[PDB]
Scaffold this active site. Structure first.
Site, PDB file in Angstrom:
ATOM      1  CG  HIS A 162       8.243  -7.387   3.794  1.00 54.68           C
ATOM      2  ND1 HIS A 162       9.331  -7.443   2.954  1.00 54.68           N
ATOM      3  CD2 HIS A 162       7.204  -6.898   3.078  1.00 54.68           C
ATOM      4  CE1 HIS A 162       8.972  -7.010   1.754  1.00 54.68           C
ATOM      5  NE2 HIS A 162       7.660  -6.655   1.809  1.00 54.68           N
TER       6      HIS A 162
HETATM    7  C1  LIG Z   1      -0.898   0.441   4.166  1.00 56.77           C
HETATM    8  C2  LIG Z   1      -0.433  -0.972   4.444  1.00 56.77           C
HETATM    9  C3  LIG Z   1       0.812  -1.206   4.977  1.00 56.77           C
HETATM   10  C4  LIG Z   1       1.273  -2.505   5.264  1.00 56.77           C
HETATM   11  N1  LIG Z   1       2.543  -2.658   5.757  1.00 56.77           N
HETATM   12  C5  LIG Z   1       2.956  -3.884   6.004  1.00 56.77           C
HETATM   13  C6  LIG Z   1       4.285  -4.088   6.481  1.00 56.77           C
HETATM   14  O1  LIG Z   1       5.109  -3.160   6.647  1.00 56.77           O
HETATM   15  N2  LIG Z   1       4.665  -5.396   6.699  1.00 56.77           N
HETATM   16  C7  LIG Z   1       3.821  -6.460   6.501  1.00 56.77           C
HETATM   17  O2  LIG Z   1       4.274  -7.615   6.702  1.00 56.77           O
HETATM   18  N3  LIG Z   1       2.567  -6.286   6.051  1.00 56.77           N
HETATM   19  C8  LIG Z   1       2.152  -5.065   5.810  1.00 56.77           C
HETATM   20  N4  LIG Z   1       0.881  -4.876   5.332  1.00 56.77           N
HETATM   21  C9  LIG Z   1      -0.006  -6.041   5.128  1.00 56.77           C
HETATM   22  C10 LIG Z   1       0.235  -6.738   3.833  1.00 56.77           C
HETATM   23  O3  LIG Z   1       0.022  -5.838   2.746  1.00 56.77           O
HETATM   24  C11 LIG Z   1      -0.712  -7.938   3.718  1.00 56.77           C
HETATM   25  O4  LIG Z   1      -0.692  -8.737   4.898  1.00 56.77           O
HETATM   26  C12 LIG Z   1      -0.442  -8.867   2.546  1.00 56.77           C
HETATM   27  O5  LIG Z   1      -0.332  -8.135   1.320  1.00 56.77           O
HETATM   28  C13 LIG Z   1      -1.542  -9.905   2.421  1.00 56.77           C
HETATM   29  O6  LIG Z   1      -1.142 -10.836   1.426  1.00 56.77           O
HETATM   30  P1  LIG Z   1      -2.250 -11.776   0.751  1.00 56.77           P
HETATM   31  O7  LIG Z   1      -1.522 -12.858   0.046  1.00 56.77           O
HETATM   32  O8  LIG Z   1      -3.257 -12.015   1.828  1.00 56.77           O
HETATM   33  O9  LIG Z   1      -2.935 -10.781  -0.287  1.00 56.77           O
HETATM   34  P2  LIG Z   1      -2.540  -9.428  -1.028  1.00 56.77           P
HETATM   35  O10 LIG Z   1      -1.070  -9.242  -1.032  1.00 56.77           O
HETATM   36  O11 LIG Z   1      -3.432  -8.370  -0.445  1.00 56.77           O
HETATM   37  O12 LIG Z   1      -3.011  -9.870  -2.490  1.00 56.77           O
HETATM   38  C14 LIG Z   1      -4.419  -9.882  -2.802  1.00 56.77           C
HETATM   39  C15 LIG Z   1      -4.577  -9.713  -4.290  1.00 56.77           C
HETATM   40  O13 LIG Z   1      -5.830 -10.313  -4.709  1.00 56.77           O
HETATM   41  C16 LIG Z   1      -6.368  -9.541  -5.748  1.00 56.77           C
HETATM   42  N5  LIG Z   1      -7.805  -9.834  -5.793  1.00 56.77           N
HETATM   43  C17 LIG Z   1      -8.760  -9.596  -4.842  1.00 56.77           C
HETATM   44  N6  LIG Z   1      -9.939 -10.062  -5.188  1.00 56.77           N
HETATM   45  C18 LIG Z   1      -9.727 -10.659  -6.423  1.00 56.77           C
HETATM   46  C19 LIG Z   1     -10.574 -11.350  -7.307  1.00 56.77           C
HETATM   47  N7  LIG Z   1     -11.849 -11.581  -7.052  1.00 56.77           N
HETATM   48  N8  LIG Z   1     -10.034 -11.846  -8.446  1.00 56.77           N
HETATM   49  C20 LIG Z   1      -8.732 -11.631  -8.682  1.00 56.77           C
HETATM   50  N9  LIG Z   1      -7.842 -10.993  -7.921  1.00 56.77           N
HETATM   51  C21 LIG Z   1      -8.415 -10.528  -6.798  1.00 56.77           C
HETATM   52  C22 LIG Z   1      -5.974  -8.104  -5.440  1.00 56.77           C
HETATM   53  O14 LIG Z   1      -5.881  -7.387  -6.645  1.00 56.77           O
HETATM   54  C23 LIG Z   1      -4.594  -8.259  -4.777  1.00 56.77           C
HETATM   55  O15 LIG Z   1      -3.502  -8.064  -5.672  1.00 56.77           O
HETATM   56  C24 LIG Z   1       0.412  -3.593   5.045  1.00 56.77           C
HETATM   57  C25 LIG Z   1      -0.867  -3.345   4.516  1.00 56.77           C
HETATM   58  C26 LIG Z   1      -1.275  -2.072   4.166  1.00 56.77           C
HETATM   59  C27 LIG Z   1      -2.650  -1.855   3.593  1.00 56.77           C
END
Ligand SMILES: Cc1cc2nc3c(=O)[nH]c(=O)nc-3n(C[C@H](O)[C@H](O)[C@H](O)COP(=O)(O)OP(=O)(O)OC[C@H]3O[C@@H](n4cnc5c(N)ncnc54)[C@H](O)[C@@H]3O)c2cc1C
Ligand SMILES: Cc1cc2nc3c(=O)[nH]c(=O)nc-3n(C[C@H](O)[C@H](O)[C@H](O)COP(=O)(O)OP(=O)(O)OC[C@H]3O[C@@H](n4cnc5c(N)ncnc54)[C@H](O)[C@@H]3O)c2cc1C
Ligand SMILES: Cc1nn(Cc2c(C)noc2C)c(=O)s1
Ligand SMILES: Cc1nn(Cc2c(C)noc2C)c(=O)s1
Ligand SMILES: Cc1nn(Cc2c(C)noc2C)c(=O)s1
Ligand SMILES: [Br-]
Ligand SMILES: [Mg+2]
Ligand SMILES: [Mg+2]
EC number: 1.8.1.12
Lengths: 486, 483
Positions: free
Chosen positions: B459
């Site tokens: 992705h």
């Molecule tokens: C610059 C960048 C580029 C990336 N590019 C890629 C890519 O090309 N391909 C790929 O596969 N991955 C990529 N990633 C990684 C990807 O973004 C993450 O692996 C993924 O979003 C993690 O998903 P998650 O479900 O762990 O949490 P996230 O998608 O990070 O969701 C976490 C959410 O929790 C919320 N939150 C945090 N603390 C609290 C709280 N206490 N109460 C309520 N809400 C809270 C935040 O607001 C956020 O919306 C990239 C990351 C970054 C930073």
């Protein structure tokens, strides 16, 4: 106020878990996030890090940056123009990205309202007790309680957050979070880090820089993109250098001061200095565990700060699970999504399933890009007695005509030489991320090198190179590299 | 001179066969072709149709044509330029393409010089007898003898040739062969055919046409690209139209005359008329068996004119084999190459092997392109009681920003729903030819839909769509579609 599942973080992992639980098993789900749409102050929002300040905007911006190469390359195919009229309007790119991200934010809003028993709560999730999530107004545990949520099951999906080295003048520096919202493209930028985010952003800035601009990437060790195939790490380094990006290896900022013109005076550990308009730190991301108050229920963290989980995303506390970047393993959206789907199929679907963290296809939208799946040869070589490496590296014909003769396409297959089984596939070049996806399926099916070389090529493609390699380039035998077997 | 193997046609299949026989099996090998380098008068040459007037040059020219879209699309990502100062220089494209093709011609020349027991002879190969190939000055069998080659084994590998309809004014029309050597880009061009060559050339001409120019494609039936996935056929029609190409379906040229200014006056069967600068016939390709004088040895042909072969590329005459387009099965370079390797392994290696013509990944370098492997649903639905179709069709986000909102990416998987076995994968959109390659490996491994949707996506990509389809869009049950 009572739910089958409460999810803290409406991100890649949290929304998959949420939506699946509600729509596949008619379960009652609360999802908590701090913000409903992208950008300052909290950056991540409904949709998560990938949607708001990650894969989605980054990819649109790398696509924008690619047009610098397209214009230059078009001339070889007879495209004629005044190269003097060419401007890269960063402000347009950022406004387009913002509109695209906002529409996704609004997409998720509709999802929550349209969907029975799937409710969004705005504010900060923390654990009060085994079965109670409290939503507060701020990240301060002392702030007003907007809600108390009763939870048969609690999912922690708060993802990660940029680490900012504790150096004097770190407050003059940005992360990727702020990079997405710069009002103007930097003339001079230092991207700090050797990982995908530093590499991708160096590419973006390099395309959008004003005239006499300079992109410098520093990395504290000798070779960027640790954990990628070594041939590809050395090649990306060359190809970024060939496109005007300055790679400072074995260098690390020691401090930053503002010059009186508002620019940044960077001093490296080595004593070297550099003046830049932007210092973007991309040295790592760290799990967002603090604000959940894990002290209150005794959820165990690892010697690295990530929520400890078993194969089923279970914490030490029954009914409490953790997926995605908070677990501090593979920080990828599709992994987070897979873990969420698996968790909900286990807990709510009575169909236990564990995410396979092996043989995951991933990419770097470097220019040119990387597509990779499975083991790099050094890692294979320690696990397997006999490893074969197949390698094809050549500038494709179109790039001899484009004038980008430095754009070598690299295709490497790493096998267990005892049975032919493909252990890893590593691609560098235009299309690599698209090529590698169906390779992920091939590795799930335990494909051998003979399955690749017996498949008929699609011609002409870079991808067909993968079906043209019959003879190892070299081997590892009990860890030792050699041209030929004994 | 005496040879273990004589190969007539120095092409995709012929060269694979010759090289393998010489280098892997240590045989003494002769190969014949009519030309040492590309272009008029005989167009194909050392290297074959693909190198000289096929896959290689056409891919370069489509890459060139793609910059028209990059030009327009860059603006959505903030690129700002003098739009009125941009020109598509077709002369430069053709010169760049010619140098690329000539470099390959030259490397094949070098391969013959540097490879012992692999000899190239220039001129027209035919069968004198079942162990003798004669090389002559011209295609005319009364032309002067250059060589007489004694052959233990003879491989027919002369490929195919454009089909030209016997219509009045055919002489005022060209094929793909001449299209590669037009000195100037046509302002008005009619591509005749709904096949990949007509569609790909329509895209090339569309990008390089001079100001106020127009590309028209005509096809006898209702929907271009027969044999391709039907959703893809309708979308590629729409996407060509959105880029300014006039698709005239249920239309076919009845005759061509010259207007007074030297332009072509086209009369369609429907009475309709069109004035164009070029008429490119791309209605089919036929096996090149005429010049081989196969009547001398009694090699069995089809009424079509193809050489009839068993699954091991054996003619009815022992020691005489045919591979590639001359066999009129799948006309793809990698199939010809595969058939050549399988034959030589069979004959010289006692390692008996037949080419699988099923589940062959292929592409169309339309704009946007197609990648496909295995069966379309209508076909699967006749051969299987229950067929599931998994379909994802949506304008990717970058194309909302680019302004090319017509560019829907289509991903379709066709399964045997009884066991989930993937029968076909059909892709339309940027990257499709690159995505489908490793899909070929999946179908060789009898991948099921569960192998796709249990694989973790990369992705963001278009390809991840293939790994995100859990639930059929519709079914065929005993040939009948059920949503
Ligand atoms: C610059 C960048 C580029 C990336 N590019 C890629 C890519 O090309 N391909 C790929 O596969 N991955 C990529 N990633 C990684 C990807 O973004 C993450 O692996 C993924 O979003 C993690 O998903 P998650 O479900 O762990 O949490 P996230 O998608 O990070 O969701 C976490 C959410 O929790 C919320 N939150 C945090 N603390 C609290 C709280 N206490 N109460 C309520 N809400 C809270 C935040 O607001 C956020 O919306 C990239 C990351 C970054 C930073
Ligand atoms: C415009 C176009 C685009 C194409 N694009 C693609 C594509 O993208 N991908 C793909 O896979 N396929 C493509 N093809 C098909 C591909 O070119 C053929 O399938 C392939 O070249 C056939 O290989 P072959 O060994 O059968 O013969 P060829 O490669 O055609 O070789 C036949 C050779 O025999 C020579 N010859 C003929 N008669 C004689 C004689 N009597 N004596 C001596 N020499 C003789 C010819 O000069 C020629 O070199 C394309 C074809 C065309 C026309
Ligand atoms: C297993 C392997 N992982 N990767 C890609 C990768 C990802 C995903 N995150 O960091 C790296 C490095 C390889 O190239 S070997
Ligand atoms: C000159 C410029 N015009 N373009 C559009 C373009 C062209 C032409 N070929 O590839 C791209 C991309 C720019 O991005 S600067
Ligand atoms: C089997 C299938 N074959 N193809 C591609 C193709 C090729 C190659 N030549 O004619 C068609 C049509 C499909 O789209 S279904
Ligand atoms: Br039809
Ligand atoms: Mg709701
Ligand atoms: Mg020789």
């Amino acid at each position: 106020k009572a739910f089958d599942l409460v999810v803290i973080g409406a991100g890649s992992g949290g929304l998959e878990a949420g939506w699946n639980a509600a729509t596949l098993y008619g379960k009652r789900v609360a999802v908590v996030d701090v913000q409903t749409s992208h950008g300052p102050p909290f950056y991540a929002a409904l949709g998560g890090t990938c949607v708001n300040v990650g894969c989605v905007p980054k990819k649109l911006m790398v696509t924008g940056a690619q047009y610098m190469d397209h214009l230059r390359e078009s001339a070889g195919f007879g495209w004629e123009f005044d190269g003097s009229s060419v401007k890269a309007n960063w402000k347009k790119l950022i406004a387009a990205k913002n509109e695209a991200v906002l529409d996704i934010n609004k997409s998720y809003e509709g999802m929550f309202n349209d969907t029975e028993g799937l409710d969004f709560f705005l504010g900060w999730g923390s654990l009060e007790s085994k079965n109670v999530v409290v939503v507060r107004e701020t990240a301060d545990p002392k702030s007003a309680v907007k809600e108390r949520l009763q939870a048969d099951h609690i999912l922690l999906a708060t993802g990660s957050w940029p680490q900012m080295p504790a150096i004097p003048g770190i407050e003059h520096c940005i992360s990727s979070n702020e990079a997405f919202y710069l009002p103007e493209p930097p003339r001079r930028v230092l991207t700090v880090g050797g990982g995908f985010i530093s590499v991708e952003f160096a590419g973006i800035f390099n395309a959008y820089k004003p005239p006499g601009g300079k992109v410098t990437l520093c990395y504290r060790n000798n070779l960027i993109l640790r954990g990628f195939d070594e041939t590809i790490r050395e090649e990306v380094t060359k190809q970024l250098t060939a496109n005007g990006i300055e790679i400072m290896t074995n260098e690390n900022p020691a401090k930053v001061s503002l010059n009186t013109d508002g620019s940044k005076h960077v001093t490296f550990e080595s004593g070297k200095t550099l003046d830049v308009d932007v210092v973007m730190m991309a040295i790592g991301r760290i799990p967002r565990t603090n604000d959940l108050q894990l002290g209150n229920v005794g959820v165990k963290l690892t010697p690295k700060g990530g929520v400890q989980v078993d194969e089923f995303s279970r914490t030490n506390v029954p009914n409490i699970y953790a997926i995605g970047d908070i677990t501090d393993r593979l920080m990828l959206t599709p992994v987070a999504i897979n873990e969420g789907a698996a968790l909900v199929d286990t807990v709510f679907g009575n169909k236990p399933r564990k995410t396979d963290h092996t043989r995951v296809a991933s990419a770097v939208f470097s220019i040119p890009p990387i597509g990779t799946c499975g083991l790099i040869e050094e890692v294979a070589a320690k696990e397997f007695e006999k490893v074969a490496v197949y390698m094809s590296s050549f500038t494709p014909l179109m790039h001899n005509i484009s004038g980008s003769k430095y754009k070598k396409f690299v295709a490497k297959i790493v096998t267990n030489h005892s049975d032919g089984t493909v252990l890893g596939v590593h691609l560098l070049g235009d299309g690599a991320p698209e090529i590698i996806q169906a390779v992920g399926v091939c590795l799930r099916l335990n494909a051998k090198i003979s399955d690749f070389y017996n498949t008929i090529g699609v011609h002409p493609t870079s991808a067909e190179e993968l079906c043209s390699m019959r003879t190892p380039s070299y081997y590892y035998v009990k860890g030792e590299k050699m041209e030929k077997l004994p």
